[PDB]
Amino acid sequence: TLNGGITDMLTELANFEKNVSQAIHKYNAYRKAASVIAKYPHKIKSGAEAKKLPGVGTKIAEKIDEFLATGKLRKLEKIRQDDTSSSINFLTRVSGIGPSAARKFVDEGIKTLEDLRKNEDKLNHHQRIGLKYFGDFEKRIPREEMLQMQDIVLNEVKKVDSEYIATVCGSFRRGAESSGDMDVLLTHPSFTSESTKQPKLLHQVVEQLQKVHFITDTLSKGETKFMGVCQLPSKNDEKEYPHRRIDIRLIPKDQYYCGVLYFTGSDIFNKNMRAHALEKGFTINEYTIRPLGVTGVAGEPLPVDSEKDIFDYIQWKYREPKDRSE
DNA sequence: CCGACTGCGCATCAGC
DNA sequence: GCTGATGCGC
């Protein structure tokens, strides 16, 4: 929070360009610039000082000079007063509603939380549940609660089959004192890059977590990914725990390391590592790191036996999960 | 300058 | 139905 005001400004501009302008590269530009300022260990005294950082160009430097001088940005002030921009920015805060749908809704007169509740028939499933838990999804999850949810998931998964390995990744694995949601990597010996010897491997886990009333809703569900809602059990007389977003990602057993690297994050850390890999002539996804041929086409999966192995190829000194919070 | 910008799963729709 | 594009989110 050394430069909270600056990175908040850029995050806001990023949110604007994505939700309103629908210029995803501008969104990413501000995301990257915000991240690199966020870790810079000095209080920034000028735009030119920030201009020295990778990802901070002239337009952002000019804005940084304005913010430091006046305490705010005129461009953001205007965007805030704007009705259409403010409305779209709100609608996109509902999970399932993106820039397109939000703009599509405003065209109809649906631009408030009240408008959505009387028009739930105009939402698809994801959007209806996102609306349903709009409040709970705005709350953070204390790590103490995260440890609770970890015990349930890892134990319920043990009961379906003792060979399931479940690892809570995301910001939790990065050691965050509080998380926005729960991310769970899942591995079973039947599912590898070679064969799917067992069908319904992820379904049986979802099924079980529903049976004990942990998973309460589903946003989307497939053979390898689950997006849904979960809730901790409360004791007698206590007010219920808020409903929480939960992601579950089944990844082939022999590709656990590329999987856990991906799922641990952060989202920008992954953006920067995959960008660095390309320059080094490699491409990383959640499954494999692969070299690029002379034509650019990816080659065969290189051998990986640890997270650090992936860092080795692209010539990065290993960074533990808590040092990936970019 | 100016092309290129991380990589992909699930829902949904256009088109056949 | 399939296939590919798009929308949204991880």
Place this chain on the structure above:
DNA sequence: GTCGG
């Protein structure tokens, strides 16, 4: 919006 080529 930024940057390497």
